[PDB]
Amino acid sequence: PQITLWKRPLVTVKIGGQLKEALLDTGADDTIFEEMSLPGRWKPIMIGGIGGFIKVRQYDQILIEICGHKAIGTVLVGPTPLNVIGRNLLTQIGCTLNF
Amino acid sequence: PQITLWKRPLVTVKIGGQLKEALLDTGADDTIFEEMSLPGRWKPIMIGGIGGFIKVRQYDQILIEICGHKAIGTVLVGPTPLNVIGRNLLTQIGCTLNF
Ligand SMILES: CCC[C@@]1(CCc2ccccc2)CC(O)=C([C@H](CC)c2cccc(NS(=O)(=O)c3ccc(C(F)(F)F)cn3)c2)C(=O)O1
């Protein structure tokens, strides 16, 4: 679709068999979800943004679907204030910024 | 322009007659810049990032040229990993998300 930015660009995403609301964030290098269960192996890492750093669990090769678009990539899990879809996954659904 | 997301959406901006780099960030409600001088009076604001909360200084009606487009709006100044253009100015330059 074409999404205006008058409000936060929140979308429904299918991940780990659940439906969840997530923010489309062009400034995020990576994708971070609040605490949730995901399959497979993970490692602890540290990511930073406004307000500093948080420790998160890195899961690789995770399937996502955003508005009918399927993708696969790394998904992080930890104490983010909300679920955020970052560029590693926005590219895969063919998301661009236009003006 | 159409900006893809394989790299960080960093653009050159002109603020206070100076050239600076800033991130185009649809995940940010607001625009925040690293410590700098801006004209006029300021008000106190607290904002959340993925790392937690920071206190910032809020300046109104600040002229900023973003990738050659003029915007005049609210600019926050505080401790940030980098300069961030949020939705308040992304909307002024006519930016949408497309996929
Ligand atoms: C001005 C605050 C902006 C924002 C708001 C989050 C929010 C939204 C609604 C409610 C509450 C909070 C969105 C955002 O993109 C980031 C940063 C990038 C600037 C962010 C987001 C997601 C992940 C990261 N970590 S990272 O390792 O993937 C990373 C590290 C650095 C950068 C860099 F480009 F900013 F340097 C981008 N990404 C950072 C953030 O920390 O908070």
Curated annotation (Swiss-Prot), chains A, B:
Coiled-coil regions listed: none
Subunit structure comment from the entry: Homodimer, whose active site consists of two apposed aspartic acid residues.
Name of the protein described by the UniProt record: Protease
Region of interest: Dimerization of protease: 1-5, 49-55, 88-99
Residues annotated as domain Peptidase A2: 20-89
Catalytic residues of the enzyme: D25
Natural source organism: Human immunodeficiency virus type 1 group M subtype B (isolate BRU/LAI) (HIV-1)
Portion of the full-length sequence here: 501 to 599 of 1447
